Each structure stands twice: as structure tokens, then as C-alpha cells.
Chains A and B, each alone.
Chain A
């Protein structure tokens, strides 16, 4: 490095809402809590559940009260 021209880089312990303790270094200095990381991300079900809107056939049939 080049003698204090970079932003300060120190170890922080950023945790997720699902626990997920990680020992990382970042130029924040204040601990951060955020949403689910890729350690527990729905990367296999977050797409299979995305298709939910569409199809008025069943909406018509549920309106078939007569």
C-alpha cells in the first residue's frame, strides 16, 4: 500500500437476519445487518415461486357461484 491514501480497512462482523456470522473486512466501521445472503438465499425456490400472477380461468371458476 501507499501510506494512508486508501479508505480505512478493518475487520467487521456483519451478520444477517438469519444469524450468519461472518468475519470480513470492510471500510464501514459500523456493524451491518441486512437481508438473507447467499448462505441461505432462496436461489432455488425464489424463482419457482415467482410465477404466481396470471390465469383468469380459475378466477372465473371461483366466481361461478350460480
Chain B
């Protein structure tokens, strides 16, 4: 509805992304969560893009 989809692209250099939904009215800035990257097998930072 109002909460639409974004993807958290990996900042470990590879092509990997988790998918989540974010309320774009209240939060206008990106998401920054440390999430597991299985290609490199370590916890890197995961910025959002689309």
C-alpha cells in the first residue's frame, strides 16, 4: 500500500541484495544495516538502492 519495496545492495563489492519494505514518507533517507553477505562469508555493511 503505502509501504513499498526497496533492496539493500551489498557494499562488499559483489552483486547481492536483501529485500525489504520501507515507509518512504516518514523515512526519506537510506537504510544502513550490517547484514551477512554469503558470497564473501562475512558481515559487511548493506546500503539500500534500486
Direct contact of A and B (CB under 8 A): no
Binding site for B on A (CB under 8 A): none
